[PDB]
Design a protein around this ligand. Structure first.
Ligand SMILES: Cc1cccc(C)c1OCC(=O)N[C@@H](Cc1ccccc1)[C@@H](O)C[C@H](CC(C)C)NC(=O)c1cccc(N)c1
Length: 331
């Protein structure tokens, strides 16, 4: 296929978060979403949502769409970040220049997601993980488009925006060379759930062999197991503000190590310039480390936004793998 591909522009927010737009209904009602490789359902607040978080948002009115098909099955959507609840509905979903009938969650109660939702500019969340990661056993949007021949390949890629520099693009259907430099290395999904792969993690002299690494566009920090983080902070001139998950350091702290994740195919690193937020802050150069300690049953690193900002990433449902390449600095 001489190119093709459905490109959706990603809108940056202070190098912290980014968003993308999609539409629901044959009348293509507009909504801003967190495009999330770490969940597998699409949800939008309904016209029937009276909570406070819903007051500033674009709302879905299924009565204005001929393609709406009632479902009604009640759903409670529990993220680590909070809870939204509502019911299943079916209607047309438009992503970029493609449309398909689709089952999403019409949310009527966001109390379990406030004050977060109230202080959010996104309307909803659009999951991009595997079918089994979803509530309802909903086949991924991209898998669908492929089934219906609307796209070349059942894969999507993320070219994240870089603040002040350039825009991003979630590209569905194929891989565009305009976004990366050097080689594109594939790492096999270890499971068809999250986009999780096995990499040895190394920082300084601490090494965690065969760490489970979740590639999540929906996580704004790099997460690290706590015992690993504990060993690496020893003597680093990095201060933890107690109670709150924040780690601060002088932006010029020479001791700051580079994260190194490796497979027999490639070696991915994240230098201090990539995980340090602030830069020229409160006082001299106090910088915040965009890293937080988080423990899962098996040692896991969530390779969130800070990793994806440096690395162009490819998500291939056909080959059950994640491809990784150095993102091009500018378009
Ligand atoms: C924003 C942020 C900062 C730092 C660390 C994290 C983890 C983070 O992100 C917080 C967060 O909630 N992110 C999620 C998406 C999200 C982002 C913003 C607001 C709400 C949800 C997903 O990216 C990841 C999340 C956790 C996994 C990786 C353990 N998945 C589920 O909870 C989930 C998955 C499948 C099914 C269901 N029902 C739920």
């Amino acid at each position: 296929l001489g190119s093709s591909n459905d490109n959706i522009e990603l809108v940056d927010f202070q190098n912290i978060m980014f968003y993308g737009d999609a539409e629901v209904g044959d009348n293509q009602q507009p909504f801003t979403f967190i495009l999330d490789t770490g969940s597998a359902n699409l949800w939008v607040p309904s016209v029937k949502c009276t909570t406070a978080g819903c007051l500033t948002k674009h709302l879905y009115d299924s009565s204005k769409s001929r393609t709406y098909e009632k479902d009604g099955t009640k759903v409670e959507m529990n993220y680590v970040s909070g809870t939204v609840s509502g019911f299943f509905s079916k209607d047309l979903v438009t992503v970029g220049n493609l449309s398909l009938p689709y089952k999403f969650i019409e949310v009527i109660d966001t109390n379990g997601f406030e004050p977060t939702y109230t202080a959010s500019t996104f309307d909803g969340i659009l999951g991009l993980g595997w079918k089994d990661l979803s509530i309802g056993s909903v086949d991924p949007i991209v898998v669908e488009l492929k089934n219906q021949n609307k796209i070349e390949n059942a894969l999507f890629t993320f070219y994240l925006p870089v603040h002040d520099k350039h825009t991003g693009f979630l590209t569905i259907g194929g891989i565009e060379e305009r976004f990366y430099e050097g080689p594109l290395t594939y790492e096999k999904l270890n499971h068809d759930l999250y986009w999780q792969i096995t990499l040895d993690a190394h920082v300084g002299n601490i090494s965690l062999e065969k760490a489970n690494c979740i590639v999540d566009s929906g996580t704004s920090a790099i997460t690290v197991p706590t015992d690993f983080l504990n060993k690496m902070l020893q003597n680093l001139d990095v201060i933890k503000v107690p109670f709150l998950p924040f780690y601060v350091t002088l932006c010029n702290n020479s001791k700051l190590p580079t994260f190194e994740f490796t497979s027999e195919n490639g070696k991915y690193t994240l230098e201090p310039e990539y995980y340090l937020q602030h830069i020229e802050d409160v006082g001299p150069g106090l910088c915040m480390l965009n890293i937080i300690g988080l423990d899962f049953p098996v040692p896991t690193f969530i390779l969130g936004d800070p990793f994806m900002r440096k690395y162009f990433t490819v998500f291939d449902y056909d080959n059950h793998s994640v491809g990784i390449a150095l993102a091009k600095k500018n378009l």
